[PDB]
């Protein structure tokens, strides 16, 4: 993928429960897999800011629950490092549901997004209210 523009310490693993920062009807997401990732023996697959992940809906509307969908990690509590050395961290972990073209399934995003995620997923960005 296109260089992110910052160094990330993956703060999530397969099975982690995160916030769905959009209005798709899904409230809580569970990480199932990380696109393009391949680990090592015993290592739990990890995901962090900027990664595209497959997810299942743990909490939300009946129609959304249990659906297996693609998403994009927009926020995480574990810090990340920007070119100027500063570390950046969020209040929670969150992802935005996305389709085969990486366009947000929802109409609006909730909460701030990291600028680095904007680079990668422009259409996701062209839905962001706040970009930090």
């Amino acid at each position: 993928m296109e260089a992110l523009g910052a160094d990330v310490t993956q703060g999530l693993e397969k099975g982690s429960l995160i916030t769905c920062a959009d209005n798709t009807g899904a409230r809580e997401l569970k990480v199932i897999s990380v696109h393009g990732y391949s680990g090592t023996k015993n290592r739990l697959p990890k995901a962090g800011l900027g990664d595209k992940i497959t997810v299942s809906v743990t909490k939300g509307t009946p129609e959304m629950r249990r659906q297996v969908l693609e998403a994009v990690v927009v926020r995480q509590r574990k810090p990340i490092r920007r070119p100027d050395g500063t570390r950046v961290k969020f209040e929670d972990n969150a992802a935005v549901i996305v389709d085969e073209n990486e366009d947000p399934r929802g109409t609006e995003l909730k909460g701030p997004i990291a600028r680095e995620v904007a680079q990668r997923f422009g259409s996701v960005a062209s839905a962001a209210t706040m970009i930090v």
Binding site: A3, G5, K41, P83, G85
Partner: protein, 337 residues
């Protein structure tokens, strides 16, 4: 079905024993291209700080932008190429033929060697030139030593001696180039060899940790879950199969870890100066203050503070040189805190 997994640790840095010379010894030198020139230099590790640089990379989306970069400060005072040793080619490889020494010696070089009192620089030179005419001359190197005294933070006064190959144009031309340096006093500096922005390979004896177990030394797992409470916590599963009936040297075991020679490749030289611009408030921890010839190496360098590190022009650079990077800031913030 027993998943695959790479082995624990590399088999290419063994045996993992205590190094014989604390002074690093390069086992390779740059190729002969440009004009003749000493292919290496040395210094003493002081500590680290960071510097904000202007992205130099012409292929970077950030070219021309601020960038914080970690730097290891190495005090690189002038050294003295004290002699010229010649190697001849023989059926059994290269062998020292003779050496051309000088008269001017640093006041304390006698803390390591028995300084020459009676030598014939011309008989030596003569034998060497005859070797070239004959075509039996191997490479040409300079016996070099440091000047610990120039460095206040380092307690040693006893100079460290190392041999550094001289490469360059034609042998005749660099042979003459070698003889010139030596004769003077051999006093040469970091500037004479490197330019800020070039890539250097740094060699040094790592920090010692004495005896350590397989977990730390080879990176084997610790025992897990229930297997961690029965009486074994940091011991590997087994020393090998029933057959072969012996323990292979490849199984991870306890032993000396640290204090090994390592040659770190492609370290970019961020800046070569003199003075106290890089020094840190309060002084570099366990080292002291810097105020003299110094080099800022990008990133980390093997060894503890005060150890002798060696520089060599990168023998296998991956990227082209981008000379004299622009340094907009050099942190001097205390390292205690």
């Amino acid at each position: 079905p027993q998943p695959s997994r790479p082995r624990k640790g590399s088999l290419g840095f063994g045996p993992r024993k205590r190094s014989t010379s604390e002074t690093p010894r390069f086992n390779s030198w740059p190729s002969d291209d440009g004009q003749p020139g000493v292919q290496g230099f040395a210094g003493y590790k002081a500590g680290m700080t960071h510097v904000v640089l202007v992205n130099d990379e012409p292929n970077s989306p950030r070219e021309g932008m601020e960038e914080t970069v970690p730097v290891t400060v190495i005090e690189t005072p002038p050294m003295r190429a004290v002699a010229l040793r010649a190697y001849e080619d023989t059926p059994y490889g290269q062998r020292p033929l003779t050496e051309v020494w000088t008269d001017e010696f640093h006041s304390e070089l006698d803390r390591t060697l028995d300084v020459p009192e009676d030598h014939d620089p011309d008989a030596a030179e003569e034998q060497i030139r005859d070797a070239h005419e004959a075509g039996d001359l191997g490479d040409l190197r300079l016996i070099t030593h440091t000047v610990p005294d120039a460095v206040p933070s380092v307690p040693k006064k006893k100079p460290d001696v190392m041999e550094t190959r001289v490469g360059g144009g034609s042998v005749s031309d660099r042979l003459d180039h070698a003889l010139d340096i030596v004769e003077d006093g051999g006093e040469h500096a970091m500037n004479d060899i490197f330019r800020a922005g070039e890539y250097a390979d740094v060699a040094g004896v790592t920090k010692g940790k004495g005896t350590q177990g397989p977990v730390k030394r080879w990176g084997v797992q610790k025992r897990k879950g229930k297997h961690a409470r029965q009486g074994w916590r940091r011991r590997i599963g087994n020393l090998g199969p029933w057959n072969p009936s012996r323990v292979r040297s490849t199984v991870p075991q306890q032993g000396q870890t640290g204090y090994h020679q390592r040659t770190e490749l492609n370290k970019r030289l961020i800046d070569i100066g003199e003075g106290d611009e890089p020094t840190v408030d309060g002084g570099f921890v366990n080292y002291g203050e810097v105020d003299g010839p110094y080099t800022l190496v990008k990133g980390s360098v093997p060894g503890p503070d005060k150890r002798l590190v060696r520089f060599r022009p990168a023998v296998r650079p991956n990227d082209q040189p981008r000379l004299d990077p622009e340094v907009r800031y050099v942190s001097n913030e205390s390292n205690q805190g």
